Amino acid sequence: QAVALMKEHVQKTMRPEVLGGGLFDLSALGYRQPVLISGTDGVGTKLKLAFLLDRHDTIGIDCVAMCVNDIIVQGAEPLFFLDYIACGKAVPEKIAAIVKGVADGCVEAGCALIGGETAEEYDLAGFAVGVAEKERLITGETIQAGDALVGLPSSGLHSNGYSLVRRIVFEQAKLSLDEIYEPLDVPLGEELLKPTRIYAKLLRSVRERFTIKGMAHITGGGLIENIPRMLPPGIGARIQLGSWPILPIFDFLREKGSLEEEEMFSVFNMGIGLVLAVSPETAAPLVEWLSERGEPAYIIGEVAKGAGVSFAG
Structure with missing residues (x-):
């Protein structure tokens, strides 16, 4: 069978x-x-x-x-x-x-x-x-200073930062995978197991109506390590803190693990699984278009001359 x-x-x-x-x-x-x-x-x-x-x-x-x-x-x-x-x-x-x-x-x-x-x-x-x-x-080669960064939400932790998660939930907090801890809304085991979002179909639809200059999948190293991989040399990113919803699981882990802000962003996706770089004028239209098809999106920042990722607000 x-x-x-x-x-x-x-x-x-x-x-x-x-x-x-x-x-x-x-x-x-x-x-x-x-x-x-x-x-x-x-x-x-x-x-x-x-x-x-x-x-x-x-x-x-x-x-x-x-x-x-x-x-x-x-x-x-x-x-x-x-x-x-x-x-x-x-x-x-x-x-x-x-x-x-x-x-x-x-x-x-x-x-x-x-x-x-x-x-x-x-x-x-x-x-x-x-x-x-x-x-x-x-290739991201056409990305220039001033371009916008549109982030598509993750479904949760996805598939990165689990070593730290296991240390926090088992070594430090001694929690139960069957219990529901605020702000989580389901048993911890179920939250930690939520499958990683697959962006294939969505991106195929998007690319038919818009020009995507570059893309970054938020995996190991989080936003900090992955956003620079799509940017040309000499170009960096300025992320606007508070421009997208940080999923509860992350607030949960930050509390239960007494974690510092920098470590968080260096390990977890913090709520964004895929970052798209587009010309300034495409940002709002793209977000609106996605919105109509039931897909949330957030303008999380902009690219600027320099290198690396820095946060503001």
């Missing part, structure tokens, strides 16, 4: 270009000068929570999101994904649940799960491949 359920999950991700191992017929898409963008990633310490809660049908999404979000910031469209599950002994139902999350993420990203491997607690590793029109690569 587990195997049967596993095949059903994979089948949902299929797209017409997949030709029965699965091959991907790129020629069907009609790219003139195709450039392949790939990436690999592991969930990380967040996996430890999956173990403790015996809930494995969502971490697969985090895995897919980490690989896919990094691909789309370069302007690529995700094509296919492959997973690698390592474990002591393989329990069918367990593997089936891990794959289900991967498939769900793949469905959200629009990429097909064309391959997998279960080799004999566990560890998950994902690999995504995307493609972009060579002359349509988003």
Whole structure:
């Protein structure tokens, strides 16, 4: 049954270009000068929570999101994904649940799960491949002083800063994953397990109506480390504190862990999972457009001559 359920999950991700191992017929898409963008990633310490809660049908999404979000910031469209599950002994139902999350993420990203491997607690590793029109690569090179930074909200902690989280919730506060602590509105275990947002579909819609000069996926190192990766040399970012909603989970962690402001921004996404750089005149229109489709967005700052990220207000 587990195997049967596993095949059903994979089948949902299929797209017409997949030709029965699965091959991907790129020629069907009609790219003139195709450039392949790939990436690999592991969930990380967040996996430890999956173990403790015996809930494995969502971490697969985090895995897919980490690989896919990094691909789309370069302007690529995700094509296919492959997973690698390592474990002591393989329990069918367990593997089936891990794959289900991967498939769900793949469905959200629009990429097909064309391959997998279960080799004999566990560890998950994902690999995504995307493609972009060579002359349509988003490099951030055209970003100039004065451009606006529009941030799209994260769903929560996403997949970074879990080492610190585990230290705070287990070593320091000695909390229970089943308890509800204010300002959180659900059990801590559930909050810490919320899957990472996948921005693939949204960005594909946005890019059809607007010119995105650059993008940054907020992962390791937070806003501080990732925003500069999309900016040209000589250009820095000025973030306006209080221009976007800092999710409760972060206020919770700051309190329960007696954390300093700088450490926070150096580890957590603080509420923003993807930052977009656009010309000044595009900022408000973009935000309004997203608003009408039920997507919140915030003008979190602007770029300026210099380098690095600084905060104000």
